[PDB]
Design a protein around this ligand. Structure first.
Ligand SMILES: CC1(C)[C@@H](O[C@H]2O[C@H](C(=O)O)[C@@H](O)[C@H](O)[C@H]2O)CC[C@]2(C)[C@H]3C(=O)C=C4[C@@H]5C[C@@](C)(C(=O)O)CC[C@]5(C)CC[C@@]4(C)[C@]3(C)CC[C@@H]12
Lengths: 583, 582
């Protein structure tokens, strides 16, 4: 259902705070959800659990963990319907109401919930256990594989993506209420015809006893259009368009109305009116060419891992404005909903991406014993959930289906083909892409024609023609010539950068130095400006972030333009110089 | 009123989130709370606003700021009373409901609230504006003075303390409900007769029609004792005590009961049965001698300033447990209430401290034109609000009235005298202290005898000009001798350490190196261990933190044993060695 909010007809209780916490063990205490959890450990809830406790065993845990607390259902919610929702459980979440299992959810970055109305009475207290598993298989969405170390028998988790596999309840948890007759979902699609905006709306409600009313109210509070019935099309004369650096949001009020025109339910949905179209080599927002600038990001901060953080979000956006970035990509999984809402308000453009990284074992990637049909089912599901949650965001401008898949290999085409079709059928208003890895050159890639925009990740400077920028430059523009020659589509570089340690400086060409980072980005830009077909540049990455451990990762990925704590490297100042002065 | 909770009779709504934010300005919008703020800025609400926006004007701003958002009172609060509460607005907060002022509060680190029951009806939406001011004066409890830079006209805030003057709503904001008859306060006081535990309670409730019941439930869910009446003494045979090693917490449920046997209001107060006592030079918890190990801390993290953060809190306590630290002090303001609850559960011991730092201009500090009796009122007020909120925490084992006052100057004894009497009077169950500065030597100080425990801050700087260890050692020992000859009280060292940059190393004796910090702590310990009267050692500081700009401050205070982002310097390992053993 829709993201809960408080209305005149709905109440909303945060369940954030400290919960009791335990790992699964191998004792008789199988089934921790059947009684009061016995632990001194408390884990804060919007957070990944891994780095919270300064304990290796928790950090390295493979398998299930348990969060628990008591909840009291407000006494005045008899006569109403009520749910427990996890905005996200990374990767597999189970909800229990006193020992009854009431939801079982497999994706790691989208919402799930359970209607507990008939299990617990208003004003009753219950024990809420939420079990979350972190295990990845070749069928989970980021896929991976658990192994056992021979000598010690320690379980270990392998996977093919960079960022660390933080787990837990990294986003907030809620108790909320709706009326018996309630709104469940709303879809809004926005076109523009001259100066007139139009909203195609569709409301889905638990009942059609009593009817649906809509009002559309502008930023000044004046009702600018009205409509009746669950589905319809509204015109808005002289619209204020939502624009890439000037957000404008109307506010769509969907209500359920009884025989007496008495409101029995209501929901307020923020709406930006704007259009995305791809025309040849151009990416058009409101019929005008747009050029992405900004980053691929990560949900990653010092202690709470991937947990949502209001402050770092608002700061992160301020830093985007400060350097004149107009966009980012939700690199390698959907971010928290609040980020998308905030982007809507900040006038920031978003490439919104599924959790589908790691579909590459370079052993044939797309085969029965690796990334097969059952993985595609999970991928299809990821696509549906992402789209079902983020479809109404004006800031969301395109769907990214995957990141660095092995789109050069046999089987890749048979695997991906249905997916861009599924997306476009779920949401026909946005174009679809994926992020292409170096191995799938314009010659070798077998999947690119099935997409509306091409996104490329490239590290010519760093990984291959190492510190040889003149060699990287030639190879970069060879590759881009190939792509422009072969496809009539917009090109966005979604990765390009260099690991860089704050304070490490050199007047020579030296990788891992701030000078090198600047020089490489600056070369890439020179090359970008040589190609009419370029529609965007998003540096990798906004900020240093944590990775699986490895002799080649210096306490994480240090390709950030800011440090993990958001201090700017020289690179940051270079981008600021370029993005505040370019078109 | 008591820290609000959700019960069967009470509802609690978090108002944290992003709020509209504006700086005050000198335009005809002289009153932003009378209408929707159309600013595009949004500030997150458990946070200080200063480093959040990446904006100078906002960071350096002196004066009021406005937070704003709409709220809806739930439909079902009809028969109910409801309030808006700020846990804290630093330093001066105002709450507005649609153009109307309904609360005005002055301290920066304790809660305030307003009964809005009669202004807004159940199911109504209203505009909530909260004004927060950051100006310090000579009468604000951390005192200060606003000044004008002559060449630029720029407004600037002076003060005498280290930590940066972060402001805003650094703590959570709430809408909550309470029945017409409700409990408003509870005092518990715990003591021991043999193996039987004693709980004196007093419950203050809005009306006396229909009685009060108390149940005391143990960690297994067993009701272990009951009582009737608004106040009384409950006996807990074979009590499990709250100990520094090992928290045990009973759960006391105070209720109001109607004519029938029907619960009208209820409230769940965690209580740990424990005594604190000073005897000669010994600090006793449950009759056995106690030695404080741990830190002076601060509420300081990278972006959110002093904003409370559950993650950093849990981690910071794991690091304490990791290095075997058993205590910390709330230098230099009461910390979030949730930290004190968490301290109760973690078995960690707390010296709880007021905002009264910076009462020192080293011109005469204690005089009619400086820190005066009007200031003393704010100070008394600060003691009152702190003790009222933290009185029931078993973790809180001592009140610290001030940090680094000029306790050596004329006027200082006459200013301070009322204050420890006031504290002991509002809480007779704990001892009172203050953290003494290096100027106020055993000779010079004229306040110390008025307190129950002596806490010394003795950075080596007080003792040596050129970072010479043997020089520092001789002077620290001389001074500690003075204190132990002249007072029969426990001594706790509450500040010692060295500015230290992570990664700066030297095989020599070099200040600002990880080695120097190690050697200095270690030398201090050797000196402390020579003195029986020592009851404690808390290093300054737990972690690196932000300060006002000073060419002597390297983007803040680097005396942390951890970095701002909680990485250990060598000193952390050295402390871990000492505290995990003896
Ligand atoms: C690592 C990935 C998957 C790709 O994404 C990465 O982004 C960031 C990073 O690189 O640091 C991090 O977020 C994280 O590490 C990853 O998600 C970046 C590109 C990537 C490293 C590829 C290459 O850079 C180049 C490769 C070449 C291709 C080719 C044709 C050649 O240049 O000659 C063959 C040799 C080689 C090394 C084969 C591997 C890839 C395709 C490589 C290393 C794969 C992984 C990519």
């Amino acid at each position: 259902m829709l993201k809960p909010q408080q209305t005149t007809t709905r109440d909303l209780i945060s369940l954030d705070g400290l919960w009791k916490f335990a790992l699964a063990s191998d004792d008789n205490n199988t089934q921790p959800w059947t009684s009061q959890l016995k632990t001194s450990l408390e884990c804060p809830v919007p957070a990944s659990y891994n780095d919270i406790f300064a304990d290796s065993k928790i950090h390295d845990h493979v398998g299930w963990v348990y969060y628990q607390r008591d909840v009291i259902v407000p006494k005045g919610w008899s006569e109403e319907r009520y749910l427990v929702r996890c905005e996200a459980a990374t990767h597999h979440g189970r909800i229990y109401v006193n020992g009854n299992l009431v939801a079982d959810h497999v994706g790691g970055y989208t919402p799930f919930e359970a209607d507990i109305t008939d299990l617990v009475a208003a004003g009753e207290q219950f024990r809420l256990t939420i079990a979350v598993d972190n295990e990845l298989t070749y069928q989970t969405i980021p896929p991976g594989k658990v192994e056992i170390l021979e000598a010690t028998g320690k379980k270990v988790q392998t996977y093919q993506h960079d960022f660390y596999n933080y787990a837990g309840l990294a986003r907030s948890v809620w108790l909320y209420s709706v009326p018996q007759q309630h709104i469940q979902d709303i879809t809004v699609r926005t076109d523009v015809q001259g100066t007139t905006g139009l909203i195609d709306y569709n409301v889905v409600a638990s009942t059609t006893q009593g009817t649906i009313q809509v009002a559309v109210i502008d930023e000044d509070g004046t009702t600018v259009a009205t409509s009746s019935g669950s589905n319809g099309t509204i015109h808005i004369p002289s619209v204020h368009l939502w624009q890439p650096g000037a957000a404008y949001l109307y506010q769509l009020h969907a209500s359920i109305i009884d025989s007496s025109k008495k409101t029995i339910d209501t929901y307020k949905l923020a709406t930006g009116i704007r259009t995305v179209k791809v025309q040849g080599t151009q990416f058009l927002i409101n019929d005008k060419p747009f050029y992405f600038t900004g980053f691929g990001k990560h949900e990653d901060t010092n202690i709470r891992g991937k947990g949502h953080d209001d402050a770092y979000m608002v700061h992160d956006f301020q830093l985007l404005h400060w350097m004149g970035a107009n966009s980012f990509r939700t690199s390698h999984y959907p971010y928290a909903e609040e980020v998308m809402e905030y982007a809507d308000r900040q006038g920031i453009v978003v490439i919104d991406e599924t959790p589908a990284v790691g579909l590459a074992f370079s052993p044939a990637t797309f085969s029965p014993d690796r990334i097969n049909n059952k993985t595609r089912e999970a991928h299809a599901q990821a696509i549906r959930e992402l789209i079902h949650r983020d479809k109404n965001h004006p800031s969301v401008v395109m769907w990214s289906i995957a990141n660095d898949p092995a789109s050069n290999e046999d089987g890749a085409r048979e695997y991906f083909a249905p997916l861009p079709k599924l997306a476009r059928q779920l949401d026909p208003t946005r174009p679809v892409t994926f992020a292409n890895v170096g191995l799938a050159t314009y010659k070798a890639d077998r999947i690119a024609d099935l997409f509306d925009v091409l996104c490329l990740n490239r590290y010519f400077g760093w990984y291959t023609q190492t510190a040889e920028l003149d060699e990287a430059e030639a190879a970069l523009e060879e590759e881009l010539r190939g792509w422009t020659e072969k496809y009539d589509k917009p090109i966005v570089m979604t990765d390009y950068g260099a690991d860089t340690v704050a304070g490490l400086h050199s007047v020579m060409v030296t990788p891992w130095s701030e000078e090198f980072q600047v020089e490489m980005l600056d070369m890439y830009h020179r090359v970008f400006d040589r190609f009419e077909a370029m529609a965007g540049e998003q540096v990798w990455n906004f900020a240093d972030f944590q990775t699986a451990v490895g002799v080649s990762r210096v306490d994480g990925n240090k390709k950030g333009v800011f440090t993990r704590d958001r201090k700017p490297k020289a690179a940051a100042h270079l981008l600021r110089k370029r993005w505040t002065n370019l078109h």
